[PDB]
Amino acid sequence: EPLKVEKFATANRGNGLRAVTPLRPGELLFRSDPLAYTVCKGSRGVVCDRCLLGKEKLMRCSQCRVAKYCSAKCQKKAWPDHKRECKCLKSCKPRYPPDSVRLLGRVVFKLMDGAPSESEKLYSFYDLESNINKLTEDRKEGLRQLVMTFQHFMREEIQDASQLPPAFDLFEAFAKVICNSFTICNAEMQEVGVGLYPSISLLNHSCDPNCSIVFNGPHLLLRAVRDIEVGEELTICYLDMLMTSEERRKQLRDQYCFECDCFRCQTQDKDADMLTGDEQVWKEVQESLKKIEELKAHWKWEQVLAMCQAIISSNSERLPDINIYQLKVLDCAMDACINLGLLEEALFYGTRTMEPYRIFFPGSHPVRGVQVMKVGKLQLHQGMFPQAMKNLRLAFDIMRVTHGREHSLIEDLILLLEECDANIRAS
Ligand SMILES: C[C@H]1CC(=O)Nc2cc(C(=O)NCCC3CC3)ccc2N1C(=O)N1CCC(N)CC1
Numbered sequence: 571e572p573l574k575v576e577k578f579a580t581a582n583r584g585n586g587l588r589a590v591t592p593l594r595p596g597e598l599l600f601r602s603d604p605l606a607y608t609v610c611k612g613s614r615g616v617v618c619d620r621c622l623l624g625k626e627k628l629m630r631c632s633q634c635r636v637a638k639y640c641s642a643k644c645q646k647k648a649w650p651d652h653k654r655e656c657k658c659l660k661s662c663k664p665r666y667p668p669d670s671v672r673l674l675g676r677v678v679f680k681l682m683d684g685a686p687s688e689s690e691k692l693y694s695f696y697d698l699e700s701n702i703n704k705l706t707e708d709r710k711e712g713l714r715q716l717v718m719t720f721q722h723f724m725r726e727e728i729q730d731a732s733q734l735p736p737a738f739d740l741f742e743a744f745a746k747v748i749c750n751s752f753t754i755c756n757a758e759m760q761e762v763g764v765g766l767y768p769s770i771s772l773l774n775h776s777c778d779p780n781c782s783i784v785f786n787g788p789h790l791l792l793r794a795v796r797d798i799e800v801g802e803e804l805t806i807c808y809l810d811m812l813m814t815s816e817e818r819r820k821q822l823r824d825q826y827c828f829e830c831d832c833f834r835c836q837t838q839d840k841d842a843d844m845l846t847g848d849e850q851v852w853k854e855v856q857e858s859l860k861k862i863e864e865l866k867a868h869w870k871w872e873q874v875l876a877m878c879q880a881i882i883s884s885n886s887e888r889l890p891d892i893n894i895y896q897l898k899v900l901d902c903a904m905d906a907c908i909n910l911g912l913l914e915e916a917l918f919y920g921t922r923t924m925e926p927y928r929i930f931f932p933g934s935h936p937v938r939g940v941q942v943m944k945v946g947k948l949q950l951h952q953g954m955f956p957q958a959m960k961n962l963r964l965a966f967d968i969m970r971v972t973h974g975r976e977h978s979l980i981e982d983l984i985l986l987l988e989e990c991d992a993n994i995r996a997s
Pocket residue numbers: 749750751752753754755756759761770771773783784785807808809810811936937
């Protein structure tokens with residue numbers, strides 16, 4: 571069709587995207603493959619470099635032995651976009667670069683060797699915001715070190731400026747990567763990769779947005795989650811919803827170089843509920859969650875579960891499940907149990923997250939959709955059919971909006987709804 575979205579110059583947040591026609595919840599607004607992407611640090615060698623799906627066995631690239639793939643088809647299909655980095659990842663073993671450096675190498679190779687990318691239809695890498703005039707001296711130093719890391723990692727393939735795009739400035743490129751990288755999660759909402767999607771990068775931030783993004787492998791779908799009028803700006807939430815206004819302030823400053831004066835931030839909306847319970851306990855839980863989240867990122871489920879049980883079933887003082895640090899611990903324990911086949915225990919943690927997720931993901935949000943699906947799935951396979959049906963329907967009501975027919979997970983949910991329904995039809 572014609573596009574439902576268009577680029578425009580906002581009054582005080584740079585370029586943005588606005589509706590061309592009225593949009594309804596669930597409407598597919600745009601979709602994109604990445605300009606460039608890579609598997610993230612914790613998922614390297616756990617999921618396929620190309621399709622970002624996990625497998626019992628992954629097969630390595632023989633030349634570098636860093637890239638790993640689910641199948642001959644994926645290894646072969648990845649080769650054009652892996653060929654030049656392969657030499658650099660070999661040449662610099664056992665040093666592995668930061669994800670941003672691997673990502674930027676892929677950018678450069680794509681812009682030098684590939685045809686114009688469909689991912690740049692509305693806006694290109696060259697156009698992206700860098701916020702160079704807002705960077706602090708401390709950030710500038712961090713970028714200088716990323717520049718030198720790139721230069722080191724890439725030296726086999728990029729020796730000088732003749733191998734970069736015209737007038738390409740690596741410092742500026744890394745400044746763009748910082749505030750335009752997308753975090754790719756798998757169907758289970760586990761972080762698996764990072765990518766650039768330059769058309770999609772037009773979206774500005776809201777702490778109460780009107781659109782959502784979801785990933786199906788590296789593919790990104792942008793959908794409305796509220797009614798949107800002609801000319802109204804499209805927004806997504808850049809951040810985890812389980813954050814206070816103070817935490818959002820620090821990240822939006824540090825990473826994005828802006829201040830938010832939205833109603834939520836002006837009123838510290840939900841902050842008090844999020845921090846209920848004794849501060850001494852939740853401070854310790856927040857500290858333990860650095861490690862728990864590190865372990866989870868590397869798919870270390872037994873270690874995750876052990877740390878989480880030490881909190882959830884502590885001998886010492888406990889927190890309410892609506893406290894965000896307690897909730898994140900429940901979440902990690904649920905995902906660990908699911909991955910370990912401890913299904914009764916998974917369901918216990920999962921069920922406890924349901925009411926806090928209802929409060930903290932208002933309206934239609936993909937993370938709540940997927941969490942409710944997980945809990946309904948656990949109930950279904952434990953033979954709890956009426957309870958399962960209610961959750962699976964709720965999951966469908968959310969995911970029909972946030973995921974839609976174009977996302978394969980919706981097909982999975984339809985099969986569970988059918989199975990649940992047959993079971994009730996017999997009963
Ligand atoms: C909702 C989901 C969807 C998803 O798959 N990824 C995902 C991406 C982004 C993202 O890229 N933000 C920056 C946007 C660029 C334009 C400036 C945010 C949230 C995400 N999501 C999520 O829940 N996150 C993030 C990842 C953490 N681990 C926790 C919570």
